[PDB]
Amino acid sequence: GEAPNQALLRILKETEFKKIKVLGSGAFGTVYKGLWIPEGEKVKIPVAIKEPKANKEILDEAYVMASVDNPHVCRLLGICLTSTVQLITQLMPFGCLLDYVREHKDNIGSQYLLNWCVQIAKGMNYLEDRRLVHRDLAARNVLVKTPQHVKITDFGLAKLLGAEYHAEGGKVPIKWMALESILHRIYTHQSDVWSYGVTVWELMTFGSKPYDGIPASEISSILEKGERLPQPPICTIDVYMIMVKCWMIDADSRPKFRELIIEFSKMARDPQRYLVIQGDMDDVVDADEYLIP
Numbered sequence: 242g243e244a245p246n247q248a249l250l251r252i253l254k255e256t257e258f259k260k261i262k263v264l265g266s267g268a269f270g271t272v273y274k275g276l277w278i279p280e281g282e283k284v285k286i287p288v289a290i291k292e293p294k295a296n297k298e299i300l301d302e303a304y305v306m307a308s309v310d311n312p313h314v315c316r317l318l319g320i321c322l323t324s325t326v327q328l329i330t331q332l333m334p335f336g337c338l339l340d341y342v343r344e345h346k347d348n349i350g351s352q353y354l355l356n357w358c359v360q361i362a363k364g365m366n367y368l369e370d371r372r373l374v375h376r377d378l379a380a381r382n383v384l385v386k387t388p389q390h391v392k393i394t395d396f397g398l399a400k401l402l403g404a405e406y407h408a409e410g411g412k413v414p415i416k417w418m419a420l421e422s423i424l425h426r427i428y429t430h431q432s433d434v435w436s437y438g439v440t441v442w443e444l445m446t447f448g449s450k451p452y453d454g455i456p457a458s459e460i461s462s463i464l465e466k467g468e469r470l471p472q473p474p475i476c477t478i479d480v481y482m483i484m485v486k487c488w489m490i491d492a493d494s495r496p497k498f499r500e501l502i503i504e505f506s507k508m509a510r511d512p513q514r515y516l517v518i519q520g521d522m523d524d525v526v527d528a529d530e531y532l533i534p
């Protein structure tokens with residue numbers, strides 16, 4: 242009872258796109274921005290390009306990104322098979338939501354924060370429909386297309402469940418993981434809900450570091466001792482109670498992604514009741530409008 246993944250993997254000519262700038266660099270490789278002009282099409286699509294034996298890793302990320310299609314999940318546009326392997330995706334001009342929430346903290350309203358909480362829950366709920374566990378949900382891994390539209394990205398750690406994933410050992414983001422993921426290395430859709438709670442806490446604190454000034458090894462014990470992240474200042478008890486529910490030790494008593502949509506959507510209908518913030522070329526086609534079946 243496992244469905245065939247009939248997603249299409251589009252191979253892109255190196256001619257079809259040009260690089261423009263370097264958006265970011267890390268070990269493996271650098272992420273760049275550029276334009277993609279499919280030959281004989283008269284369209285220019287703003288894209289972001291990301292170019293060992295780690296090719297097995299980047300090709301696993303491409304498989305996952307090519308198999309998702311949701312307004313709040315970044316989809317792979319294609320890959321380029323030159324001397325280096327490149328991943329081409331739609332350009333998210335405003336960067337990651339973590340940096341955006343930091344560089345604009347004096348201009349972000351409750352309506353935007355709660356809407357972001359709704360959109361991330363919508364994208365996370367879609368990944369659960371597709372039986373996909375992200376395992377690395379964080380504010381740094383949510384990209385901003387427009388201030389009103391954010392999407393989930395970075396599926397390097399994502400794993401597809403059959404019809405409870407048991408990792409072995411890898412550089413993992415300790416401070417965002419559920420307690421069972423720390424101790425047993427078990428990952429469930431409800432393990433992503435814990436990460437979702439930390440991600441919401443990142444937004445409501447305008448980019449603060451969770452457990453700032455704490456060793457990563459001491460985290461497993463303080464979570465057993467009953468300790469969680471503090472109530473952010475702008476957070477009513479209503480919003481903070483939801484974040485606390487995502488961090489319960491019993492994983493099945495945690496909120497579901499389908500329910501986090503409903504609760505935050507109800508809150509976005511009256512944002513100031515739940516968040517208290519002081520003073521509330523020519524042929525360019527966005528990739529969300531370029532659809533080839």
Ligand SMILES: *CCC(=O)N1CCC(Oc2cc3c(Nc4ccc(Cl)c(Cl)c4F)ncnc3cc2OC)CC1
Nearest residue numbers: 264265289290291328329330331332333334336337340
């Ligand atoms: C906040 C953390 C941080 O330092 N960075 C994250 C955002 C980067 O800037 C931009 C990145 C992208 C990406 N990234 C991307 C991720 C996975 C894959 Cl496979 C591919 Cl191909 C990617 F391109 N995607 C789309 N748009 C942007 C836009 C960015 O800034 C404008 C820099 C480092």
